[PDB]
Design a binder for this molecule. Structure first.
Ligand code: V6Q
Length: 458
């Protein structure tokens, strides 16, 4: 809420990972965990840990005087720029004018030219924030002002704020991508209606205060450089996510559950569910609360199967990913999920199949399994169907080169044992393009040129 309390101050100084966890455990018992206090603590700790060092053990001590001074600076800056008497508050509901004023206060503070700039620590000490950091700063600013209805909203690649009753009102508060036109102040209604992945068809997350704590924990970046992660930051993020898990605050947060599964893959915690249980809990959350319209729950699971060389389930999970994305329209600012499908289609899957081909060279493999070929076809069907109704095209000559190569990783005998139905394993296509070349996909010899122009047709 507002003002540091003795119950928080007695927990200082923070001298270890477990000290930070204990501060978070106390704040998560409050009805209103202090977003400014917790973000400053995480940003401080991350700032001094995300460096290569000499010294086996090291923890940067979060002295209260330092944290409380930064907290006072944030609060003074917000209370001194936002006069609440000029904005009437009709029974708890903040107005769009007030919410936009706070957004502008944050925005106008940013440095005008410029990793680890996600926290309020970075905001106060260096006037820098990344994109979703701005939207978090706005929610923390509003909590500092008493606006109990202003909350963070998150898709899988963007953030904004919701407010009013039940989060009825939406407002853009930050940028997305690089060269895009500013939409700050506007509603996200256009984004929902265009059926872009960026806005999730309205199936995005609306946080309570405690899901906002989960966000900032997920936002911890342990990366030191391109080769090195901070183990202390990974262990801190992992323990915080278990604390959140235990209190039920990940129940509606699929990406956090995927993140925790990844951390348990890296370093299993004794007595806790295994990664596969956690990946599927993430998928179950997305089905339960978000109409099964999220991509990353299946990308998380696919990556795990891929790393463990469960080729069939990896291709299964990647097809599920395509089955979700087929109902979207590829818009301009959807590039992050495009790059992911590109990498899966034209790098990861070829490598998986090429490794599988080498294994047959010297010995029940997936290249002799028709199910895996079915998964591969459902994956490409979803991406073709995704392209339908989309403004800009998805597939091009490069996709066709690796589709051809991937189909040719299966013996024509093996591919022939899959039944393809239009709109042994049986599979039903949904896209015009895949239906159009259904014949080419089962011939003992693959007309590469023919498939290439059909997959690239208008
Ligand atoms: C599961 O994949 C994720 C999750 C979050 C961000 C990016 C990716 C793609 N590597």
């Amino acid at each position: 809420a507002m003002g540091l309390k003795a119950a928080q101050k007695t927990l200082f100084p923070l001298r270890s990972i477990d000290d930070v966890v204990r501060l978070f455990a106390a704040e998560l018992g409050r009805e209103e965990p202090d977003l400014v206090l917790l973000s400053l603590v995480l940003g401080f700790v991350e700032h001094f840990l995300a460096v290569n060092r000499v010294g086996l053990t090291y923890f940067p001590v979060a002295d209260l005087s330092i944290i409380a001074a930064l907290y006072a600076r944030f609060t003074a800056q917000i209370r001194g720029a936002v006069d609440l008497s000029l904005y009437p508050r009709e029974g708890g509901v903040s107005s769009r004018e007030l919410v936009k004023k706070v957004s502008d206060v944050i925005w106008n503070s940013l440095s005008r030219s410029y990793a680890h700039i996600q926290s309020l620590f970075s905001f106060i000490t260096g006037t820098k924030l990344d994109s979703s950091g701005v939207a978090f700063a706005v929610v923390g600013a509003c909590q500092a002002l008493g606006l109990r209805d202003v909350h963070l909203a998150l898709s899988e690649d963007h953030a904004w704020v919701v407010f009013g009753p039940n989060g009825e009102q939406t407002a853009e508060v930050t940028w997305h991508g690089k060269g895009n036109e500013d939409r700050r102040g506007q509603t996200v209604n256009a984004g929902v209606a265009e059926r872009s992945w960026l806005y999730l068809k309205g199936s995005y997350m609306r946080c309570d205060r405690k899901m906002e704590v989960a966000f900032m924990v997920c936002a911890i970046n342990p990366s030191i450089d391109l080769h090195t992660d901070s183990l202390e930051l990974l262990q801190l993020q992992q323990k915080l996510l278990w604390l959140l898990y235990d209190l039920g605050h990940l129940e509606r947060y699929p990406m956090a559950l995927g993140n925790l599964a990844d951390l348990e893959e890296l370093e299993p915690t004794p007595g806790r569910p295994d990664p596969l249980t956690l990946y599927h809990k993430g998928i179950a959350s997305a089905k339960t609360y978000y109409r099964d319209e999220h991509i990353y729950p299946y990308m998380y699971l696919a990556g795990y199967h891929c790393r463990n060389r469960n080729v069939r389930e990896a291709l299964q999970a990647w097809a599920d990913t395509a089955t979700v994305i087929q109902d979207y329209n590829y818009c301009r600012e959807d590039e992050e999920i495009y790059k992911e499908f590109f990498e899966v289609a034209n790098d990861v899957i070829p490598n998986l199949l090429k490794e599988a081909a080498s294994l047959l060279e010297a010995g029940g493999s997936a290249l002799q399994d028709p199910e895996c070929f079915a998964h591969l076809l459902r994956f490409y069907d979803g991406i073709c169907k995704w392209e339908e109704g989309s403004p800009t095209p998805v597939l091009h000559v490069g996709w066709a080169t690796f589709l051809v190569q991937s189909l040719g990783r299966f013996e024509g005998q093996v591919r022939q044992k899959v039944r393809i139905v239009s709109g042994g394993p049986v599979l039903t296509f949904q896209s015009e393009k895949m239906k159009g070349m259904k014949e080419l996909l089962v011939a003992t010899k693959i007309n590469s040129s023919a498939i290439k122009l059909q997959l690239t047709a208008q």
